[PDB]
XYZ file of C-alpha atoms in Angstrom:
270
model
C 37.107 -31.798 -3.192
C 37.803 -32.148 -7.022
C 33.943 -32.560 -8.206
C 33.218 -31.516 -11.513
C 29.839 -31.069 -13.484
C 30.063 -31.990 -17.029
C 27.863 -31.789 -20.068
C 27.689 -34.966 -21.838
C 25.780 -34.674 -25.303
C 23.135 -38.014 -26.054
C 22.727 -38.417 -29.741
C 19.876 -40.743 -29.196
C 17.775 -37.959 -26.593
C 19.069 -35.009 -28.759
C 19.854 -32.947 -25.665
C 22.931 -32.948 -23.396
C 22.952 -34.596 -20.112
C 24.464 -33.118 -17.169
C 27.144 -35.412 -15.003
C 28.393 -34.790 -11.781
C 31.900 -36.702 -11.466
C 34.814 -37.354 -9.175
C 38.178 -38.890 -10.653
C 40.134 -41.030 -8.675
C 40.623 -44.224 -10.890
C 40.238 -46.012 -14.077
C 36.974 -47.966 -12.647
C 33.915 -45.979 -11.603
C 30.689 -46.370 -9.389
C 27.723 -45.479 -11.346
C 25.502 -43.819 -8.704
C 21.807 -44.059 -9.779
C 18.949 -41.477 -9.037
C 15.733 -42.300 -7.391
C 12.203 -41.475 -8.816
C 12.105 -37.811 -8.205
C 15.233 -37.414 -9.731
C 15.898 -33.313 -10.632
C 17.681 -31.585 -13.694
C 20.398 -29.913 -11.175
C 21.831 -32.192 -9.238
C 21.938 -36.045 -8.425
C 20.044 -37.152 -5.099
C 23.283 -38.463 -3.810
C 24.922 -35.078 -4.024
C 21.749 -33.673 -2.465
C 21.219 -36.027 0.399
C 24.621 -37.671 1.223
C 28.266 -37.294 1.503
C 28.521 -39.909 -1.206
C 31.686 -37.757 -2.974
C 33.567 -37.343 0.084
C 33.107 -40.988 1.529
C 34.454 -42.375 -1.975
C 37.088 -39.619 -1.978
C 40.499 -41.355 -2.518
C 38.671 -44.827 -2.849
C 40.943 -45.521 -5.709
C 37.510 -45.614 -7.321
C 35.892 -42.803 -9.553
C 32.394 -41.781 -9.040
C 29.778 -41.410 -11.844
C 26.465 -39.402 -10.950
C 24.287 -38.351 -14.053
C 21.692 -35.835 -13.751
C 18.018 -35.606 -14.644
C 15.753 -38.412 -15.954
C 12.641 -38.475 -13.712
C 10.642 -41.542 -13.686
C 13.067 -42.879 -16.531
C 14.239 -46.312 -14.677
C 17.340 -45.564 -16.679
C 15.741 -47.353 -19.626
C 15.228 -46.854 -23.341
C 11.546 -46.028 -23.733
C 9.352 -47.088 -26.644
C 7.951 -43.590 -27.176
C 7.786 -39.856 -25.742
C 5.576 -40.027 -22.286
C 1.990 -39.345 -24.083
C 0.158 -36.868 -21.529
C 3.019 -34.634 -19.755
C 4.226 -33.197 -23.388
C 7.717 -35.182 -23.236
C 8.696 -34.065 -26.631
C 11.769 -36.672 -26.903
C 11.954 -40.519 -26.437
C 14.039 -41.284 -23.205
C 16.814 -43.535 -24.267
C 19.085 -43.718 -20.807
C 20.023 -47.141 -21.406
C 22.006 -46.290 -24.513
C 22.918 -43.321 -22.612
C 24.756 -45.420 -19.805
C 25.715 -47.977 -21.805
C 27.049 -46.203 -25.244
C 27.335 -42.391 -24.893
C 28.409 -41.465 -21.912
C 31.140 -44.437 -21.171
C 32.229 -43.250 -24.546
C 32.755 -39.635 -23.656
C 34.343 -40.094 -20.288
C 36.830 -42.972 -21.697
C 38.200 -40.298 -24.579
C 38.099 -37.073 -22.374
C 38.857 -38.737 -18.878
C 40.481 -42.245 -19.466
C 37.783 -43.882 -17.249
C 37.422 -47.301 -18.786
C 33.972 -48.554 -19.952
C 34.574 -51.968 -18.921
C 34.614 -53.445 -15.033
C 32.400 -50.671 -13.252
C 29.772 -50.847 -10.569
C 26.263 -49.980 -10.666
C 24.213 -48.729 -7.802
C 20.536 -47.943 -7.643
C 17.796 -47.097 -5.374
C 14.203 -47.055 -5.195
C 13.656 -46.763 -8.897
C 16.892 -47.338 -10.088
C 17.577 -50.474 -7.710
C 15.984 -52.534 -10.569
C 17.807 -50.697 -13.248
C 21.224 -51.390 -11.779
C 20.458 -55.116 -11.943
C 19.016 -55.051 -15.522
C 22.003 -53.358 -16.673
C 24.600 -55.646 -14.901
C 22.210 -58.649 -16.398
C 22.487 -57.424 -20.072
C 26.176 -55.327 -19.889
C 28.220 -57.579 -17.809
C 31.574 -56.496 -18.813
C 30.544 -52.711 -18.659
C 29.198 -54.268 -14.666
C 30.221 -57.039 -12.988
C 29.076 -55.339 -9.622
C 25.580 -54.143 -9.240
C 23.509 -52.841 -6.006
C 19.997 -52.503 -5.808
C 18.929 -50.539 -2.615
C 15.051 -50.544 -2.013
C 14.406 -51.373 -5.798
C 11.540 -53.082 -7.476
C 12.838 -56.288 -8.122
C 9.917 -57.871 -10.026
C 8.247 -55.107 -11.849
C 6.669 -57.407 -14.286
C 4.866 -59.391 -11.692
C 1.381 -58.989 -9.469
C 0.639 -55.274 -7.738
C 3.775 -54.160 -9.317
C 2.950 -53.055 -12.827
C -0.044 -51.046 -11.333
C 2.057 -49.622 -8.190
C 4.787 -48.447 -10.751
C 2.405 -46.967 -13.096
C 0.906 -45.034 -10.505
C 4.768 -43.962 -9.221
C 5.500 -42.571 -12.469
C 2.364 -40.533 -12.720
C 3.157 -39.113 -9.145
C 6.595 -38.393 -10.268
C 5.987 -35.486 -13.191
C 2.990 -37.365 -14.953
C 5.414 -40.018 -16.754
C 3.206 -42.899 -18.737
C 4.444 -46.501 -17.899
C 2.655 -47.725 -21.031
C 4.716 -45.184 -23.003
C 8.066 -46.892 -21.293
C 7.610 -50.640 -21.926
C 3.830 -50.916 -23.213
C 1.011 -52.755 -21.470
C 2.049 -55.180 -18.547
C 1.445 -57.858 -21.240
C 4.177 -56.277 -23.190
C 7.989 -58.261 -23.642
C 9.578 -55.179 -22.241
C 8.191 -55.643 -18.835
C 9.842 -58.915 -18.408
C 13.158 -57.893 -20.321
C 13.866 -55.555 -17.596
C 12.359 -57.870 -14.941
C 15.493 -58.292 -12.230
C 14.067 -61.678 -10.813
C 13.086 -62.899 -14.353
C 16.908 -61.975 -15.250
C 18.235 -63.859 -12.370
C 19.626 -66.642 -15.028
C 21.870 -63.574 -16.620
C 23.077 -62.675 -13.200
C 23.697 -66.194 -12.776
C 25.536 -66.783 -15.735
C 27.493 -63.560 -16.041
C 28.362 -64.270 -12.412
C 27.463 -60.862 -11.226
C 28.360 -59.729 -7.808
C 25.155 -58.435 -6.569
C 24.315 -56.651 -3.367
C 20.451 -56.351 -2.563
C 19.182 -54.002 0.479
C 15.525 -54.413 1.625
C 14.968 -52.021 4.740
C 11.825 -52.087 6.933
C 9.836 -49.073 7.497
C 7.336 -46.685 4.930
C -3.408 -44.741 -2.360
C -2.761 -48.145 -0.305
C -2.286 -48.731 3.250
C 1.454 -48.801 4.389
C 1.094 -52.312 5.551
C 0.070 -53.847 2.707
C 2.823 -52.219 0.569
C 5.640 -53.217 3.173
C 4.033 -56.847 2.757
C 4.256 -56.963 -0.696
C 7.736 -55.398 -0.673
C 8.738 -58.175 1.866
C 7.231 -60.888 -0.184
C 8.896 -59.990 -3.499
C 12.212 -59.634 -1.917
C 12.197 -63.021 -0.390
C 10.986 -64.525 -3.680
C 14.189 -62.529 -5.749
C 16.339 -63.826 -2.786
C 15.006 -67.351 -2.937
C 15.175 -67.538 -6.897
C 18.878 -66.379 -7.137
C 19.609 -69.237 -4.502
C 17.825 -71.706 -6.328
C 18.810 -70.723 -9.627
C 22.558 -71.514 -8.542
C 23.488 -68.094 -7.736
C 26.722 -67.465 -5.637
C 27.843 -64.364 -5.358
C 25.339 -61.840 -4.023
C 25.333 -59.948 -0.494
C 21.658 -59.979 0.908
C 20.790 -57.200 3.427
C 17.657 -57.183 5.420
C 17.921 -55.181 8.710
C 15.282 -54.595 10.582
C 16.356 -51.245 11.714
C 17.050 -50.009 8.240
C 14.735 -47.777 6.377
C 13.854 -46.461 2.722
C 15.845 -43.259 2.696
C 18.998 -41.611 1.827
C 20.422 -41.918 5.415
C 20.241 -45.859 5.257
C 20.686 -46.054 1.426
C 24.212 -43.992 2.278
C 24.782 -46.281 5.040
C 24.522 -49.126 2.367
C 26.922 -47.091 -0.235
C 29.646 -46.858 2.900
C 28.952 -50.669 3.864
C 29.842 -51.501 0.244
C 32.449 -49.464 -0.243
C 35.321 -52.503 0.717
C 33.287 -54.863 -1.304
C 33.151 -52.940 -4.487
C 37.438 -52.136 -3.925
C 38.138 -55.578 -3.673
C 35.633 -56.788 -6.598
C 36.475 -53.871 -9.053
C 40.147 -53.536 -8.045
C 41.383 -56.628 -6.483
């Protein structure tokens, strides 16, 4: 399997970002990592046969490495508490720096790709497509935070980020009253997804500091109001997968990635 590991400089973050890569076509599936993203390998490669599954799919596969608790967004400032000595700029990296590098050196097109995220990055994928539709006519969110700015979600996200390497949500998007929370809220940005005619794939499995069943109910509720709002707002290009058997884990996230392969091939290469 022709898998490569790349070192892609990021001017905005002042360091090189490692990227796992598999070629196979000009358009690419960007596979974004979960909350506890490591600096050696992307979770998709640690936990799943993703590369092998998309081998000879006509699609390249990109797996950026690093960015624990980053939400693949551009932060306001370095995380204040855990000694981060630079500012996260992952939206800048994914939409400008990395595509530029991959085009010049490998001929991967900066346009007409898929963004696929899970847990932390599920919402990120949708937000990337909302604001960069030419880069991402396709986005998948597998167990993502679909309404990060509302209700319990700013508190829970902040707690999760602290539990994942001590990162501070306030350094990311500000107090929950800051415009940045709504800017990066996929439900709030549904009208953009509808206007861009983004092909979206949303998965919400069963299963899983607060009782499991309270969390489930918040999650179910949020995922249904996203779904309802998408349809109400004129959305006609979504797939919504809520299987009872489905779980919030790599084996079912891989199940969804394999399930969506034909969908992506047809939208990107059809």
